[PDB]
Amino acid sequence: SHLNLDALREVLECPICMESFTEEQLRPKLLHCGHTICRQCLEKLLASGVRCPFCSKITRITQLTDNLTVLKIIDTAG
Amino acid sequence: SHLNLDALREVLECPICMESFTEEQLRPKLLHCGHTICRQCLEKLLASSGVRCPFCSKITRITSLTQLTDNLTVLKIID
Ligand SMILES: [Zn+2]
Ligand SMILES: [Zn+2]
Ligand SMILES: [Zn+2]
Ligand SMILES: [Zn+2]
């Protein structure tokens, strides 16, 4: 099966702070709109729900689901 | 950045029917629990409908697949 190499790099780092996702600090969080931002960038919007900056839908108030696809890919437990 | 190759293969195919995700037929759909199943397998579980995830027993309440979010990460990868 094919795969896009440039797109694979984009999805592994937060589109805001441009740092690569981690399991704890920059944990990839799934907004209800489907876009993914890290936990730290998500904390900035926690000062008040949360409005996604790419599509203008808002995510309600952390019981947010993790981006399980990203976490499995960057898993290096072995 | 590093990445798990075997895990990268797992996430690019439906964990139920073992078919690789596509953009239309086997479109990867995001359940509310965070797990992803293809568009075709989801119709089978919506035929018996909410939708029950077969890996974690959480339920997703939908009446049409257009209400479920796509897995934007998978779709970007296979674009
Ligand atoms: Zn970030
Ligand atoms: Zn969004
Ligand atoms: Zn399937
Ligand atoms: Zn589940």
Side-chain angles (χ1 to χ4, degrees), chain A residues 1-4 7-8 10-12 20 30 32-36 65-70 72-76, chain B residues 1-4 7-8 10-12 20 30 32-36 58 69-74 76-79:
Chain A
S1 52
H2 78 292
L3 179 147
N4 191 323
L8 180 53
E10 292 184 294
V11 304
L12 292 184
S20 291
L30 260 176
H32 292 175
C33 54
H35 291 106
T36 298
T65 36
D66 301 313
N67 191 327
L68 296 181
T69 322
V70 173
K72 276 186 61 65
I73 285 175
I74 64 164
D75 184 46
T76 326
Chain B
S1 52
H2 307 268
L3 59 90
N4 190 323
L8 180 53
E10 292 184 294
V11 304
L12 292 184
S20 291
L30 261 176
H32 292 175
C33 54
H35 291 106
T36 298
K58 287 193 173 175
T69 11
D70 301 313
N71 191 328
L72 296 180
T73 322
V74 173
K76 276 186 61 65
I77 286 175
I78 64 164
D79 184 46

Short mmCIF file of all heavy atoms in Angstrom, two decimals, chain A residues 1-4 7-8 10-12 20 30 32-36 65-70 72-76, chain B residues 1-4 7-8 10-12 20 30 32-36 58 69-74 76-79:
data_model
loop_
_atom_site.label_atom_id
_atom_site.label_comp_id
_atom_site.label_asym_id
_atom_site.label_seq_id
_atom_site.Cartn_x
_atom_site.Cartn_y
_atom_site.Cartn_z
N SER A 1 0.82 -1.20 0.00
CA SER A 1 0.00 0.00 0.00
C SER A 1 0.86 1.26 0.00
O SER A 1 1.86 1.34 0.72
CB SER A 1 -0.94 0.01 1.21
OG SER A 1 -0.23 -0.21 2.41
N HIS A 2 0.47 2.24 -0.81
CA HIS A 2 1.23 3.47 -0.93
C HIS A 2 1.13 4.29 0.35
O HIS A 2 0.36 3.99 1.27
CB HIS A 2 0.72 4.29 -2.12
CG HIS A 2 -0.54 5.04 -1.83
ND1 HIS A 2 -1.75 4.40 -1.64
CD2 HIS A 2 -0.79 6.36 -1.70
CE1 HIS A 2 -2.69 5.31 -1.40
NE2 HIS A 2 -2.13 6.50 -1.44
N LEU A 3 1.92 5.36 0.40
CA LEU A 3 1.91 6.27 1.54
C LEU A 3 2.58 7.57 1.14
O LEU A 3 3.55 7.57 0.38
CB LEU A 3 2.63 5.63 2.74
CG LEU A 3 2.78 6.40 4.06
CD1 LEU A 3 2.74 5.42 5.22
CD2 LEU A 3 4.07 7.19 4.09
N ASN A 4 2.06 8.68 1.66
CA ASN A 4 2.61 10.00 1.38
C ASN A 4 3.63 10.34 2.46
O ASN A 4 3.28 10.41 3.65
CB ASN A 4 1.50 11.06 1.32
CG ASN A 4 1.99 12.39 0.78
OD1 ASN A 4 3.11 12.83 1.05
ND2 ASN A 4 1.14 13.05 0.00
N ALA A 7 3.20 14.09 3.93
CA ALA A 7 2.02 14.16 4.78
C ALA A 7 2.23 13.41 6.09
O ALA A 7 1.74 13.83 7.15
CB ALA A 7 0.80 13.62 4.05
N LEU A 8 2.96 12.29 6.05
CA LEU A 8 3.24 11.53 7.26
C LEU A 8 4.05 12.35 8.27
O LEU A 8 3.87 12.19 9.48
CB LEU A 8 3.98 10.24 6.92
CG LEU A 8 4.35 9.32 8.08
CD1 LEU A 8 3.12 9.00 8.93
CD2 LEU A 8 5.00 8.04 7.58
N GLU A 10 3.88 15.71 8.52
CA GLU A 10 3.01 16.77 9.03
C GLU A 10 2.15 16.29 10.18
O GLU A 10 1.99 16.99 11.19
CB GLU A 10 2.13 17.31 7.89
CG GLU A 10 2.89 18.06 6.82
CD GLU A 10 1.98 18.66 5.77
OE1 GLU A 10 1.34 17.88 5.02
OE2 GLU A 10 1.89 19.90 5.68
N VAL A 11 1.58 15.08 10.06
CA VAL A 11 0.63 14.59 11.06
C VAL A 11 1.30 14.18 12.36
O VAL A 11 0.60 13.95 13.35
CB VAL A 11 -0.17 13.40 10.51
CG1 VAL A 11 -0.86 13.77 9.21
CG2 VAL A 11 0.74 12.19 10.31
N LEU A 12 2.63 14.09 12.40
CA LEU A 12 3.33 13.66 13.60
C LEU A 12 3.80 14.82 14.47
O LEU A 12 4.41 14.58 15.52
CB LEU A 12 4.53 12.79 13.22
CG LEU A 12 4.19 11.43 12.61
CD1 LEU A 12 5.44 10.61 12.38
CD2 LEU A 12 3.20 10.67 13.49
N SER A 20 7.02 17.97 17.61
CA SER A 20 6.55 16.62 17.38
C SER A 20 5.77 16.11 18.58
O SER A 20 6.12 16.38 19.73
CB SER A 20 7.72 15.69 17.09
OG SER A 20 8.31 15.98 15.83
N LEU A 30 -7.59 14.73 20.19
CA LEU A 30 -8.57 14.79 19.11
C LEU A 30 -9.70 15.74 19.49
O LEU A 30 -10.45 15.47 20.43
CB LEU A 30 -9.12 13.40 18.81
CG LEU A 30 -8.53 12.65 17.62
CD1 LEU A 30 -9.12 11.25 17.53
CD2 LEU A 30 -8.80 13.42 16.34
N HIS A 32 -13.40 17.38 18.54
CA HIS A 32 -14.60 16.74 18.00
C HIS A 32 -14.74 16.97 16.50
O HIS A 32 -15.45 16.21 15.83
CB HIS A 32 -15.84 17.25 18.72
CG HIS A 32 -15.93 16.81 20.15
ND1 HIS A 32 -16.92 17.25 21.01
CD2 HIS A 32 -15.15 15.98 20.88
CE1 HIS A 32 -16.74 16.70 22.20
NE2 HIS A 32 -15.67 15.93 22.15
N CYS A 33 -14.08 17.99 15.95
CA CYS A 33 -14.10 18.23 14.51
C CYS A 33 -13.17 17.31 13.74
O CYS A 33 -13.25 17.26 12.50
CB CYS A 33 -13.73 19.68 14.22
SG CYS A 33 -12.16 20.20 14.94
N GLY A 34 -12.29 16.57 14.42
CA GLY A 34 -11.37 15.65 13.78
C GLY A 34 -9.94 16.14 13.69
O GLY A 34 -9.04 15.31 13.49
N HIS A 35 -9.70 17.44 13.82
CA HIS A 35 -8.35 17.96 13.79
C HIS A 35 -7.63 17.66 15.10
O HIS A 35 -8.25 17.47 16.15
CB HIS A 35 -8.35 19.46 13.51
CG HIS A 35 -8.80 19.82 12.13
ND1 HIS A 35 -10.04 20.35 11.86
CD2 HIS A 35 -8.17 19.71 10.93
CE1 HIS A 35 -10.15 20.56 10.56
NE2 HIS A 35 -9.03 20.18 9.97
N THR A 36 -6.30 17.63 15.03
CA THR A 36 -5.47 17.22 16.16
C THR A 36 -4.53 18.35 16.55
O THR A 36 -3.84 18.92 15.70
CB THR A 36 -4.66 15.97 15.81
OG1 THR A 36 -5.56 14.88 15.52
CG2 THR A 36 -3.75 15.57 16.96
N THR A 65 -10.63 12.74 23.56
CA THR A 65 -10.03 11.50 23.10
C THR A 65 -8.64 11.77 22.52
O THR A 65 -8.41 12.80 21.88
CB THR A 65 -10.91 10.84 22.05
OG1 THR A 65 -11.53 11.84 21.23
CG2 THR A 65 -11.99 9.99 22.71
N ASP A 66 -7.72 10.85 22.78
CA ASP A 66 -6.40 10.94 22.18
C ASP A 66 -6.45 10.57 20.70
O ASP A 66 -7.36 9.87 20.24
CB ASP A 66 -5.41 10.03 22.91
CG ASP A 66 -5.28 10.38 24.38
OD1 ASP A 66 -5.12 11.57 24.70
OD2 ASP A 66 -5.33 9.45 25.21
N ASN A 67 -5.45 11.04 19.96
CA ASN A 67 -5.28 10.60 18.58
C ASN A 67 -4.54 9.27 18.64
O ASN A 67 -3.31 9.22 18.70
CB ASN A 67 -4.52 11.65 17.76
CG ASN A 67 -4.55 11.36 16.27
OD1 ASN A 67 -4.56 10.20 15.85
ND2 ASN A 67 -4.57 12.41 15.46
N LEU A 68 -5.31 8.18 18.66
CA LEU A 68 -4.73 6.86 18.84
C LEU A 68 -3.85 6.46 17.66
O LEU A 68 -2.90 5.68 17.83
CB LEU A 68 -5.84 5.83 19.05
CG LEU A 68 -6.68 6.01 20.32
CD1 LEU A 68 -7.73 4.92 20.45
CD2 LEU A 68 -5.78 6.06 21.55
N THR A 69 -4.15 6.96 16.47
CA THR A 69 -3.35 6.63 15.29
C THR A 69 -1.94 7.19 15.43
O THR A 69 -0.95 6.51 15.13
CB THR A 69 -4.03 7.17 14.04
OG1 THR A 69 -5.45 7.00 14.15
CG2 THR A 69 -3.55 6.42 12.81
N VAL A 70 -1.83 8.45 15.86
CA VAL A 70 -0.51 9.06 16.05
C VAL A 70 0.25 8.35 17.16
O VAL A 70 1.44 8.05 17.03
CB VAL A 70 -0.65 10.57 16.32
CG1 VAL A 70 0.69 11.17 16.70
CG2 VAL A 70 -1.23 11.27 15.11
N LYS A 72 0.05 5.27 18.35
CA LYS A 72 0.56 3.96 17.95
C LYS A 72 1.77 4.09 17.03
O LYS A 72 2.72 3.31 17.13
CB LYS A 72 -0.55 3.15 17.27
CG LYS A 72 -1.47 2.43 18.23
CD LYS A 72 -2.44 1.52 17.49
CE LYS A 72 -1.70 0.46 16.69
NZ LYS A 72 -0.95 -0.48 17.56
N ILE A 73 1.75 5.08 16.13
CA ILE A 73 2.84 5.23 15.17
C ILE A 73 4.14 5.62 15.87
O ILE A 73 5.21 5.09 15.55
CB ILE A 73 2.44 6.25 14.09
CG1 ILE A 73 1.44 5.63 13.12
CG2 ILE A 73 3.67 6.74 13.33
CD1 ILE A 73 0.92 6.60 12.10
N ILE A 74 4.06 6.52 16.85
CA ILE A 74 5.27 7.06 17.46
C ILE A 74 5.65 6.24 18.69
O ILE A 74 6.57 6.60 19.43
CB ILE A 74 5.09 8.54 17.84
CG1 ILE A 74 4.00 8.70 18.90
CG2 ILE A 74 4.77 9.37 16.60
CD1 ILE A 74 4.02 10.05 19.59
N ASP A 75 4.94 5.13 18.91
CA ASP A 75 5.24 4.26 20.04
C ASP A 75 6.62 3.63 19.87
O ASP A 75 6.92 3.02 18.84
CB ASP A 75 4.18 3.17 20.17
CG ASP A 75 4.40 2.29 21.38
OD1 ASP A 75 4.65 2.83 22.47
OD2 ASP A 75 4.31 1.05 21.23
N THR A 76 7.47 3.79 20.89
CA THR A 76 8.82 3.26 20.90
C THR A 76 9.10 2.54 22.21
O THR A 76 10.19 2.63 22.78
CB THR A 76 9.85 4.36 20.66
OG1 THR A 76 9.30 5.34 19.77
CG2 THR A 76 11.11 3.78 20.03
N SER B 1 11.99 12.47 13.48
CA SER B 1 11.14 11.71 14.39
C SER B 1 11.13 10.23 14.02
O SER B 1 11.23 9.87 12.85
CB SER B 1 9.71 12.26 14.38
OG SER B 1 9.22 12.37 13.05
N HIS B 2 11.01 9.37 15.03
CA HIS B 2 10.95 7.93 14.81
C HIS B 2 9.50 7.46 14.76
O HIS B 2 8.58 8.15 15.21
CB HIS B 2 11.71 7.19 15.91
CG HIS B 2 13.12 7.66 16.09
ND1 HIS B 2 14.19 7.10 15.43
CD2 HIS B 2 13.63 8.65 16.86
CE1 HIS B 2 15.30 7.72 15.78
NE2 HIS B 2 14.99 8.66 16.65
N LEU B 3 9.30 6.27 14.20
CA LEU B 3 7.96 5.74 14.03
C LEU B 3 8.02 4.22 13.92
O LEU B 3 9.00 3.66 13.42
CB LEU B 3 7.26 6.34 12.80
CG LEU B 3 7.86 6.19 11.41
CD1 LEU B 3 7.36 4.93 10.72
CD2 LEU B 3 7.54 7.42 10.58
N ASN B 4 6.97 3.57 14.39
CA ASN B 4 6.87 2.11 14.39
C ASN B 4 6.29 1.65 13.06
O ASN B 4 5.17 2.04 12.70
CB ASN B 4 6.01 1.64 15.56
CG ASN B 4 6.07 0.13 15.77
OD1 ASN B 4 6.13 -0.64 14.81
ND2 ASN B 4 6.04 -0.29 17.03
N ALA B 7 3.29 -0.83 13.48
CA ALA B 7 2.12 -0.07 13.91
C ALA B 7 1.59 0.80 12.78
O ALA B 7 0.37 0.99 12.65
CB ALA B 7 2.46 0.77 15.14
N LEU B 8 2.49 1.35 11.96
CA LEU B 8 2.05 2.14 10.82
C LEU B 8 1.25 1.29 9.84
O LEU B 8 0.32 1.79 9.19
CB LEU B 8 3.26 2.77 10.12
CG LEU B 8 2.98 3.64 8.89
CD1 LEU B 8 1.96 4.72 9.20
CD2 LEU B 8 4.28 4.26 8.39
N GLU B 10 -0.59 -1.36 10.80
CA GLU B 10 -1.85 -1.68 11.47
C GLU B 10 -2.87 -0.57 11.29
O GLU B 10 -4.04 -0.82 10.99
CB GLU B 10 -1.60 -1.94 12.95
CG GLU B 10 -0.80 -3.20 13.26
CD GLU B 10 -0.67 -3.45 14.75
OE1 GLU B 10 0.00 -2.64 15.43
OE2 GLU B 10 -1.23 -4.45 15.24
N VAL B 11 -2.43 0.68 11.46
CA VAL B 11 -3.36 1.81 11.45
C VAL B 11 -3.86 2.16 10.06
O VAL B 11 -4.82 2.93 9.94
CB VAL B 11 -2.71 3.05 12.09
CG1 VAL B 11 -2.23 2.74 13.50
CG2 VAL B 11 -1.57 3.57 11.22
N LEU B 12 -3.25 1.62 9.01
CA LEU B 12 -3.65 1.93 7.64
C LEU B 12 -4.63 0.93 7.06
O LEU B 12 -5.06 1.09 5.92
CB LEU B 12 -2.42 2.03 6.74
CG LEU B 12 -1.49 3.21 7.00
CD1 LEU B 12 -0.36 3.25 5.98
CD2 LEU B 12 -2.27 4.52 7.00
N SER B 20 -7.17 -2.50 3.63
CA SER B 20 -6.55 -1.19 3.74
C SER B 20 -7.57 -0.09 3.50
O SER B 20 -8.44 -0.20 2.62
CB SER B 20 -5.39 -1.06 2.75
OG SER B 20 -4.32 -1.91 3.11
N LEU B 30 -14.08 7.77 12.41
CA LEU B 30 -13.68 7.89 13.81
C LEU B 30 -14.89 7.66 14.71
O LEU B 30 -15.85 8.44 14.67
CB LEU B 30 -13.07 9.26 14.09
CG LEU B 30 -11.55 9.36 14.13
CD1 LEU B 30 -11.13 10.81 14.31
CD2 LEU B 30 -10.99 8.49 15.23
N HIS B 32 -16.57 7.63 18.53
CA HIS B 32 -16.43 8.58 19.62
C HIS B 32 -15.43 8.12 20.68
O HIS B 32 -14.92 8.95 21.43
CB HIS B 32 -17.79 8.84 20.26
CG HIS B 32 -18.75 9.57 19.37
ND1 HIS B 32 -20.06 9.81 19.72
CD2 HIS B 32 -18.58 10.12 18.14
CE1 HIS B 32 -20.66 10.47 18.74
NE2 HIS B 32 -19.78 10.67 17.78
N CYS B 33 -15.14 6.82 20.74
CA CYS B 33 -14.13 6.30 21.65
C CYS B 33 -12.71 6.51 21.14
O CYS B 33 -11.76 6.31 21.90
CB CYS B 33 -14.36 4.81 21.91
SG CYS B 33 -14.46 3.82 20.41
N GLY B 34 -12.55 6.92 19.88
CA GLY B 34 -11.25 7.15 19.30
C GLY B 34 -10.77 6.07 18.35
O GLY B 34 -9.85 6.32 17.56
N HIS B 35 -11.37 4.89 18.40
CA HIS B 35 -10.99 3.82 17.48
C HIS B 35 -11.55 4.09 16.09
O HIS B 35 -12.55 4.79 15.91
CB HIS B 35 -11.48 2.47 18.00
CG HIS B 35 -10.77 2.01 19.23
ND1 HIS B 35 -11.36 2.03 20.48
CD2 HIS B 35 -9.52 1.51 19.41
CE1 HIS B 35 -10.50 1.57 21.37
NE2 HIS B 35 -9.38 1.25 20.75
N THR B 36 -10.90 3.50 15.09
CA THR B 36 -11.20 3.74 13.69
C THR B 36 -11.57 2.42 13.01
O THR B 36 -10.85 1.43 13.15
CB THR B 36 -10.02 4.38 12.97
OG1 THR B 36 -9.73 5.66 13.56
CG2 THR B 36 -10.33 4.58 11.49
N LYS B 58 -17.42 0.60 24.35
CA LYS B 58 -18.11 1.88 24.32
C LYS B 58 -19.04 1.96 23.11
O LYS B 58 -18.87 1.26 22.11
CB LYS B 58 -17.09 3.03 24.27
CG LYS B 58 -16.36 3.25 25.58
CD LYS B 58 -15.60 4.57 25.58
CE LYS B 58 -15.01 4.87 26.95
NZ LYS B 58 -14.18 6.10 26.94
N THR B 69 -17.04 11.65 12.36
CA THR B 69 -15.86 12.32 11.83
C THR B 69 -14.95 11.33 11.12
O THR B 69 -14.81 10.18 11.53
CB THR B 69 -15.09 13.02 12.95
OG1 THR B 69 -15.61 12.61 14.22
CG2 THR B 69 -15.21 14.53 12.82
N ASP B 70 -14.34 11.79 10.03
CA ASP B 70 -13.33 10.99 9.36
C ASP B 70 -12.04 10.99 10.16
O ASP B 70 -11.78 11.88 10.98
CB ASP B 70 -13.07 11.52 7.95
CG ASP B 70 -14.30 11.54 7.09
OD1 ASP B 70 -15.03 10.52 7.05
OD2 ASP B 70 -14.55 12.57 6.44
N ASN B 71 -11.21 9.98 9.92
CA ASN B 71 -9.86 9.93 10.48
C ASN B 71 -8.97 10.75 9.56
O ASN B 71 -8.42 10.24 8.58
CB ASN B 71 -9.38 8.50 10.63
CG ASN B 71 -8.11 8.39 11.45
OD1 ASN B 71 -7.26 9.28 11.44
ND2 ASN B 71 -7.96 7.27 12.16
N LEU B 72 -8.81 12.03 9.89
CA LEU B 72 -8.06 12.94 9.03
C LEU B 72 -6.59 12.53 8.96
O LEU B 72 -5.94 12.76 7.93
CB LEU B 72 -8.17 14.37 9.56
CG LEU B 72 -9.53 15.05 9.57
CD1 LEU B 72 -9.39 16.45 10.13
CD2 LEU B 72 -10.13 15.10 8.17
N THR B 73 -6.06 11.92 10.02
CA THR B 73 -4.67 11.50 10.01
C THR B 73 -4.43 10.40 8.99
O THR B 73 -3.47 10.46 8.21
CB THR B 73 -4.25 11.03 11.41
OG1 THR B 73 -4.87 11.86 12.40
CG2 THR B 73 -2.75 11.17 11.55
N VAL B 74 -5.30 9.38 8.97
CA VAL B 74 -5.15 8.29 8.01
C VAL B 74 -5.33 8.80 6.58
O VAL B 74 -4.56 8.44 5.68
CB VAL B 74 -6.13 7.15 8.34
CG1 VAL B 74 -6.11 6.10 7.24
CG2 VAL B 74 -5.78 6.52 9.67
N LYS B 76 -4.87 11.78 5.30
CA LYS B 76 -3.73 12.57 4.87
C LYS B 76 -2.56 11.67 4.48
O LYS B 76 -1.84 11.95 3.52
CB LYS B 76 -3.31 13.54 5.98
CG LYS B 76 -4.10 14.83 6.00
CD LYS B 76 -3.53 15.80 7.03
CE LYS B 76 -2.09 16.17 6.71
NZ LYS B 76 -1.97 16.92 5.43
N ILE B 77 -2.36 10.58 5.22
CA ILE B 77 -1.23 9.69 4.97
C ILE B 77 -1.38 9.00 3.62
O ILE B 77 -0.41 8.88 2.86
CB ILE B 77 -1.10 8.67 6.11
CG1 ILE B 77 -0.53 9.34 7.36
CG2 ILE B 77 -0.25 7.49 5.70
CD1 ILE B 77 -0.49 8.43 8.56
N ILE B 78 -2.58 8.54 3.28
CA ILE B 78 -2.79 7.72 2.09
C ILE B 78 -3.21 8.57 0.90
O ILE B 78 -3.54 8.04 -0.16
CB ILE B 78 -3.83 6.62 2.36
CG1 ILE B 78 -5.20 7.24 2.67
CG2 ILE B 78 -3.38 5.73 3.51
CD1 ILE B 78 -6.35 6.27 2.58
N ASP B 79 -3.20 9.89 1.06
CA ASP B 79 -3.58 10.78 -0.04
C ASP B 79 -2.60 10.68 -1.21
O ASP B 79 -1.39 10.84 -1.03
CB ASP B 79 -3.69 12.23 0.43
CG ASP B 79 -4.18 13.16 -0.66
OD1 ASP B 79 -5.16 12.80 -1.35
OD2 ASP B 79 -3.59 14.25 -0.83
#
